[PDB]
Amino acid sequence: REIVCVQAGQCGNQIGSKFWEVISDEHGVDPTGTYQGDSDLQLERINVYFDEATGGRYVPRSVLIDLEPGTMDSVRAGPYGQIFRPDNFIFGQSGAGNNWAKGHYTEGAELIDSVLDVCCKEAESCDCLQGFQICHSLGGGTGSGMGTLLISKLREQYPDRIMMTFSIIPSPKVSDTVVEPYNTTLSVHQLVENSDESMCIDNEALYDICFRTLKLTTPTFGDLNHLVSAVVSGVTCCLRFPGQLNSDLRKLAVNLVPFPRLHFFMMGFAPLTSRGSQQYRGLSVPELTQQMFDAKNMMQAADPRHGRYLTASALFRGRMSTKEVDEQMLNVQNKNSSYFIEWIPNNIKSSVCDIPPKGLKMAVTFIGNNTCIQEMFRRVGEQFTLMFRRKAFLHWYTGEGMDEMEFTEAESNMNDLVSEYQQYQDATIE
Amino acid sequence: QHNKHPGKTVMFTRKDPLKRGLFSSYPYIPEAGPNIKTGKVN
Numbered sequence: 001r002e003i004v005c006v007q008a009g010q011c012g013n014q015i016g017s018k019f020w021e022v023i024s025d026e027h028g029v030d031p032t033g034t035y036q037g038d039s040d041l042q043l044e045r046i047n048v049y050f051d052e053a054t055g056g057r058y059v060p061r062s063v064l065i066d067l068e069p070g071t072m073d074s075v076r077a078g079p080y081g082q083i084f085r086p087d088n089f090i091f092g093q094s095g096a097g098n099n100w101a102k103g104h105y106t107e108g109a110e111l112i113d114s115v116l117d118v119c120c121k122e123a124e125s126c127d128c129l130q131g132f133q134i135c136h137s138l139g140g141g142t143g144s145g146m147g148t149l150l151i152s153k154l155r156e157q158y159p160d161r162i163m164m165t166f167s168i169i170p171s172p173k174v175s176d177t178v179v180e181p182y183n184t185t186l187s188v189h190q191l192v193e194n195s196d197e198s199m200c201i202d203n204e205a206l207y208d209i210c211f212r213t214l215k216l217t218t219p220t221f222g223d224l225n226h227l228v229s230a231v232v233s234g235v236t237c238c239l240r241f242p243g244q245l246n247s248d249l250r251k252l253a254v255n256l257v258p259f260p261r262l263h264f265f266m267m268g269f270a271p272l273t274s275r276g277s278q279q280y281r282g283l284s285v286p287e288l289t290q291q292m293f294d295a296k297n298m299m300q301a302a303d304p305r306h307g308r309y310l311t312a313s314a315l316f317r318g319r320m321s322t323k324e325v326d327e328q329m330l331n332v333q334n335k336n337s338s339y340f341i342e343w344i345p346n347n348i349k350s351s352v353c354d355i356p357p358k359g360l361k362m363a364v365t366f367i368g369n370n371t372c373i374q375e376m377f378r379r380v381g382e383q384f385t386l387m388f389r390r391k392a393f394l395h396w397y398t399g400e401g402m403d404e405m406e407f408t409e410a411e412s413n414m415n416d417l418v419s420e421y422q423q424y425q426d427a428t429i430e
Numbered sequence: 431q432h433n434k435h436p437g438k439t440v441m442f443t444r445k446d447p448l449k450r451g452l453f454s455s456y457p458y459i460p461e462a463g464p465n466i467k468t469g470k471v472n
């Protein structure tokens with residue numbers, strides 16, 4: 001059951017570098033590629049993320065794509081950069097310019113053939129292939145354009161597998177790019193048709209996590225990308241270690257998505273402890289559950305109190321009783337019954353895995369499907385309508401060749417997604 | 431001023447939430463003639 005990773009754009013390549021550092025650490029792989037681990041439990045599932053090269057070495061199943069190699073030169077110069085296969089770096093000769101049409105139509109069609117040949121070679125090498133995993137930002141240019149182009153081509157090639165994306169979405173308070181509404185709207189239109197499950201992260205939520213919860217004095221992008229790499233490596237933990245209640249990406253999708261358009265989820269990771277307070281709180285399943293449901297620990301700006309949970313999933317790592325997990329999930333569902341959709345009798349799935357991450361006694365990752373995500377799309381649609389009515393920057397996209405009708409389709413599809421969430425929020429048994 | 435997450439905590443739990451450690455409990459429901467005669471004779 002093998003996963004293939006794709007890293008696109010600056011954000012994707014940097015998060016991928018930190019992810020492969022975390023994964024190499026958990027399985028005891030030296031940056032030269034030699035196994036130096038201390039338990040057979042590490043070796044027996046190494047195939048899930050690594051392919052074996054001759055005389056001991058392991059290589060990571062990842063494709064790196066970008067339109068200018070600057071970020072790739074930074075990752076190759078990094079401490080673990082040597083592990084990556086040289087032939088897996090695909091690059092052009094000019095940047096995306098933060099423009100969706102350029103990234104999708106001009107340099108996209110020029111490079112895409114080499115990316116599909118690398119992705120097909122990597123996928124076919126697996127003895128049994130599980131879904132793909134893609135990291136990119138939706139507000140950028142090569143991330144949005146090449147991510148959605150490659151997702152569409154892989155969905156044509158491998159329609160029976162899973163398509164999973166980790167995506168960065170624009171903050172509600174400060175923009176990092178002026179033309180964010182167009183790129184976000186077109187990317188969400190592409191994802192709702194092509195994707196099977198999509199997770200969304202706001203950089204503002206990670207900044208507030210670092211400052212309030214971890215009280216870091218001088219955080220850097222390495223810390224934010226470490227938090228993301230921790231949750232990303234946590235969702236797949238039950239795929240690659242033994243446990244009392246095994247789980248799989250398809251089982252999460254089957255339990256989380258009630259209707260095919262409603263596949264956007266909130267994400268969280270629980271055992272974050274403040275830099276000077278570990279002496280004040282013991283590890284226990286109730287402590288993890290309490291942090292698990294605290295909105296301070298959620299990586300999106302929308303708050304659960306304005307919506308209702310359709311479904312949620314918790315994956316536990318560590319040696320613990322099943323009774324405590326089941327009774328905690330029952331107590332949280334019974335005490336807060338108004339925030340759970342009433343026509344579903346149980347919204348939470350639990351899973352338990354025996355092997356925790358190194359240096360932690362226990363850990364859990366939380367995935368939540370909540371209707372409050374409709375507030376983000378409504379805000380993006382408002383900003384899109386403000387910019388489009390006045391043709392604010394439209395000449396770049398139209399000059400590249402885009403039909404204006406594409407913008408009206410994407411706006412209509414996002415507005416219908418918001419309407420569908422609002423209708424399911426206020427549905428009743430009668 | 432530092433920006434903040436716009437979500438406030440509502441959900442709360444506790445350790446050992448079950449009553450007496452049991453998921454459920456069942457209620458209490460309350461609750462001839464003479465024989466053959468013989469002997470030595472002459």
Ligand SMILES: Nc1nc2c(ncn2[C@@H]2O[C@H](COP(=O)(O)OP(=O)(O)O)[C@@H](O)[C@H]2O)c(=O)[nH]1
Pocket residue numbers: 008009010011012014015096098137139140141142143144168170176203221224225
């Ligand atoms: N968490 C995180 N966000 C990033 C990182 N680099 C860029 N971003 C964000 O991603 C957006 C910029 O997209 P970018 O990656 O430059 O798009 P590209 O030009 O197509 O590669 C902005 O919101 C940045 O704040 C990173 O290393 N980590």
